[PDB]
Amino acid sequence: PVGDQPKDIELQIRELILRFISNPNSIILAVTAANTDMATSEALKISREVDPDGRRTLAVITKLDLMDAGTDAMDVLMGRVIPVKLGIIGVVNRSQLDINN
Amino acid sequence: MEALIPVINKLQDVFNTVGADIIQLPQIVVVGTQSSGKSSVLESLVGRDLLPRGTGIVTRRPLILQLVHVSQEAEEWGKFLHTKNKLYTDFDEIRQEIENETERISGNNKGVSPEPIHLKIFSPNVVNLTLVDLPGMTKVPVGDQPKDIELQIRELILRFISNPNSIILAVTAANTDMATSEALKISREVDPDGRRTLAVITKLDLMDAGTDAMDVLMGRVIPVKLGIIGVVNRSQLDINNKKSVTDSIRDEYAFLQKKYPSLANRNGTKYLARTLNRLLMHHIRDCLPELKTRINVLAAQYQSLLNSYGEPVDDKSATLLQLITKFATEYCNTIEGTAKYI
Amino acid sequence: TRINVLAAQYQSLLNSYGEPVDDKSATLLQLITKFATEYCNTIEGTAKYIETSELCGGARICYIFHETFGRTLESVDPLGGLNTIDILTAIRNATGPRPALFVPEVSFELLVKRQIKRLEEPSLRCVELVHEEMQRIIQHCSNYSTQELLRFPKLHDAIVEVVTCLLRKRLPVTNEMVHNLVAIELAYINTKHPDFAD
Amino acid sequence: TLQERLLAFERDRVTIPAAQVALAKQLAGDIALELQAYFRSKFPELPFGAFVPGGPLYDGLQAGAADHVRLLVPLVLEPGLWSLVPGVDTVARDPRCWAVRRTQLEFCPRGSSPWDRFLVGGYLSSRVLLELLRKALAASVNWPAIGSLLGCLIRPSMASEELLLEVQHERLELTVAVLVAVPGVDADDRLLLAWPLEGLAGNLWLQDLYPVEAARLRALDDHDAGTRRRLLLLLCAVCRGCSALGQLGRGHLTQVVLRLGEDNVDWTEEALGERFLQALELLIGSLEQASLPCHFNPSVNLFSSLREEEIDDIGYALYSGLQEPEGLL
Amino acid sequence: SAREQRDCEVIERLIKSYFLIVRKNIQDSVPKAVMHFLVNHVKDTLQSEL
Amino acid sequence: VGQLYKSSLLDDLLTESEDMAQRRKEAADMLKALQGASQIIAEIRETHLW
Ligand SMILES: Nc1nc2c(ncn2[C@@H]2O[C@H](COP(=O)(O)OP(=O)(O)CP(=O)(O)O)[C@@H](O)[C@H]2O)c(=O)[nH]1
């Protein structure tokens, strides 16, 4: 809880997320950065609360260009670590500088 | 290392194209008593004066050297852990920075630090390799050293040589008694059989006149699984006189031919370098069946995937009729309750 | 005296390889023959190289066909999948659109087959395990004889490759047979079987 | 009476002949030592420690063949390269299971450790470890040499990672539960068991609090020379001699007795009957709620895997046990 | 020899016993193969064949 | 049969899923990589030349 956030801001945001992802009729985009541990993806962790099987959840790995050098997410991408019904797709995009440039 | 540069690169792609981890090369760790010639041995494996060198006590804080292969993406440069991404195209600065950093923790009064220095060296004509330059073995606590500095250094050595996946270079001076080589003595603590320990005899040119190490070299005194190889190198004067490699070779060769004619072509540093290359090639060979095994496993997996569709059907007519027949059959069977799919 | 002693030592070293082989043909055939002989003997358990070690070559396959395979099958079903209520549904389905005076034999005739189908997997696994062991025979074979084939390393490895090629050639053939064997059990149920009565 | 019956019941149903116990302990060591030697030659690359026999056979009185011989296989992970993570912290959100995280890859990259053969993503694979080690036991181990050496029939089970003594020449049969686990703690208690989770990530691990629970009951008894473990031993034999209690194992009884143990009542042998009925009452109440929270982890309902109706029927069976105490004995 | 004849009789018993086991299995094996490879096969193929 | 068994429909109705075709193509292409891994095996042989 930082700034003007409440003690349970984690749960507030969690419920704000659940407000939408709890609807079967939706596509859940589990966006997590490549240089973080995908196995702990909070995106997927909360997705499993409303879609434990991943039937309408797509795993998204961004910042592949920032991925920790020497490591990979091939096992995640290939479903060896994280099995996803809609598959796992990585993403490369603009940094602060590339947006500003 | 020479033709290994492209051989190994090809042997990286053998893993890259199957999704496997690339074989790691054993850590190169040099051991032995103070001023036996340890750092110099490592220097001969680089071609640059990257290490501190000298008599008495010099190395006072293990160096962790990471050789780095550079792609076609500064031609050659270094990088220290404690200076982040600072690039060192000045390789004298690198040596001096090791000296500086050594003094920062271990000090400048014979004190030895347990905190090693991490240095990466980059070039497009080198291959990824981890090496360790250790402080010499001692007995007496001198300067800033602790009562158990012998044991401290011993443990600092054991920290690296205790790893099976390493090459232990037992560097001991020719003019000392090889039978008491502390290098080998500590090597036997982690490698009692010498399976990954190579005996190195330096300063052959300083060997006590009238004596020899033929019995040591021939395994009569010291049996070594990787063999025993002698070394000739620059003294204080020859370093300060900038004796070239060619000059060193001439002196080494001529000396060895005059000293051990028959063993001269085994002691020859070039022979050693080729031997080391061979040892790495053997290290590679050890896991080529594992590589091939994966290839076989993957093939079964890919064929299993191909078995998911079976065929593309070049018959058409018969295929269609079969598909129709099977459907209608099971359809009618479903009506009966006699379907295969109950 | 030393000159004489050394000569014996150097000749002993020369005896480590014996000869450089100027015959080629006969030599190759002998090397092949000896390998294949001991290879087959290893299968039999009649090899000259009876080094006491891990069970391999011969009786290891006996182990596979009993301690592994036989036991594996013993763990399968025989009542697995038999949910009474689901079976009652199944026999209602077996009756189908008509009325019935009694339950159809179709019942167990299909339910048995489901269990029989489960016996195909571990059977094929057994085959694979043997295939592995057949390759392990080469590893065993490499503990001896090879020292002569070290004079022709290239040949040595070529031999190994050919052996495993042959093994792979005969692999799928056995697989087809085993598959068929299961299919045969699925093909027909003999309620007149001598051990089957109720 | 109940008191008298329990005392006889211990002698007649708890005690498993000392000759078999001693032989079992001998074989426990012998099997361990053989497997130590085997793993040294089969997995020289891996830092397996000395294997440790344990369980009821040692943990209590003459258990003998009444339950598995527990055999620890020590997965000596390289300190600093591996770290313990809660399963709930990952996408596979199961707090009961645990993960072993690979780290310090910036100084020690994958391929440098022998345990990196089990590295999937950035975690240690309990699954692959089990697959290889179970295969080793399944076929690789020369059980004909073991049987010949020890004078017995010993082979691998067809489930989990257990072994079977089909018969030691001296009229003994028993089973061995091989527990492959990371040493874990310097207390020599809590382990990271190579768990065989089928769902989620099969790479996940189980925090082994067995010896912790056993030590706790031991300590609780040693605090006042009580007989909490004696009650447990009685209850174990009751379950062995009662098919109605086939769904309630040693673990189930342990949780109940731990709850009982945390109390200040007459803990002497003279009140076995009293505490026996108390144990029934506590267990029955838990069964009536269809809930048994583990003493060292209340989020684990040990009755959650059982049918509610069967759970109640067990409580009813035990209730008739309360009505006729000696009928359980 | 007489002892050897007795040993032969043992062998004959082993032959008979094992043979009968084999034959018994064959009695079920063949029929099934015929049904599988011929009868049940053409039962389904014939339609597409015609 | 009367409706579906036409010579034109043998080209029309018998059209394969492209997604399926690509999936199996990739499996084949990975197998082609393992055909290329016979050159890895060639390299295995090459490492014995030193
Ligand atoms: N003549 C001669 N001198 C040598 C040889 N090898 C090393 N030296 C000399 O011995 C001294 C020690 O060399 P160095 O490589 O620094 O040894 P070291 O064992 O690393 C010293 P420390 O144990 O403190 O790290 C230097 O003065 C060097 O010139 C040799 O083969 N011949």
Ligand SMILES: [Mg+2]
């Ligand atoms: Mg030095």
